[PDB]
């Protein structure tokens, strides 16, 4: 709708702020991946589970290269 | 006691303790060693509480 798109703006603010914390910690995630992680934190997610899967998937693009 | 630093008074080395230096994102153990001198009581203001942190910052370098 319209207020359904101004709500996408109020998240678009946050994903600009979360992009800056991502670069000062020198991480490998970018702007596209972080939008998946935010929806996952909406349902509730364990970040001790999310770090071990990313530590495998980043080696999965290097083992099928 | 296995090198000669053992003639210092027991109170001053007793107040010495080890503190862990700031967490590194999986770097060397050289980054996680500190010495911390216990200060509390009346002398906590004389050896100013604000000063001690910067003093440890000097010892890091």
């Amino acid at each position: 709708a319209a207020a359904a798109a101004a709500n996408l703006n109020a998240v678009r603010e946050t994903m600009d702020v979360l992009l800056e914390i991502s670069r000062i910690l020198n991480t490998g995630l970018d702007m596209e991946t972080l939008s998946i992680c935010v929806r996952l934190c909406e349902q509730g997610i364990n970040p001790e589970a999310l770090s071990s899967v990313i530590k495998e998937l980043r080696k999965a693009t290097e083992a099928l290269k | 006691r296995a090198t000669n630093a053992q003639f210092d008074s027991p109170e001053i080395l007793r107040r010495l303790d080890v503190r862990l230096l700031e967490v590194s994102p999986g770097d060397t153990g050289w980054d996680v060693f500190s010495l911390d001198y216990h200060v509390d009581g009346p002398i906590a203001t004389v050896f100013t509480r604000e000063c001690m942190s910067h003093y440890l910052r000097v010892f890091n370098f």
Binding site: V11, V17, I24, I36, C41, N46, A49, V53, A60 | -
Partner: protein
């Protein structure tokens, strides 16, 4: 959304490959995420902020230790996320020392 397709979006993000060509990683993903989907330890944004302070003090930038306090301030300011500990613990666990990274501009 639906929790099964969201893990399937993640494996198309990190690997460039199609999703009917990778099916081994998506099985290991349900193995780790499944039956541990809720955090097995409690949330605390207090500790993870003080460890993001512990990394920028170790680089000896005390302007960025208060710059990060303004980014964590903006995170509370929007408030569209209810687990502010989760997304930051992730970036903390994935942290490395840049010795650099001066382009901070916020908002």
């Amino acid at each position: 959304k639906s929790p099964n397709v969201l893990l399937q979006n993640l494996c198309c993000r990190i690997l460039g490959r199609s999703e009917a060509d990778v099916a081994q990683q998506f099985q290991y993903a349900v193995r780790v995420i499944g039956s541990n989907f809720a955090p097995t330890v409690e949330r605390d944004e207090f500790l993870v902020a003080e460890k993001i302070k512990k990394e920028l003090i170790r680089q000896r930038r005390e302007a960025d230790a208060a710059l990060f306090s303004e980014l964590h301030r903006k995170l509370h300011s929007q408030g569209v996320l209810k687990n502010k500990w989760s997304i930051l613990y992730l970036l903390l666990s994935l942290s490395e020392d840049p010795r650099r990274q001066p382009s901070k501009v916020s908002s």
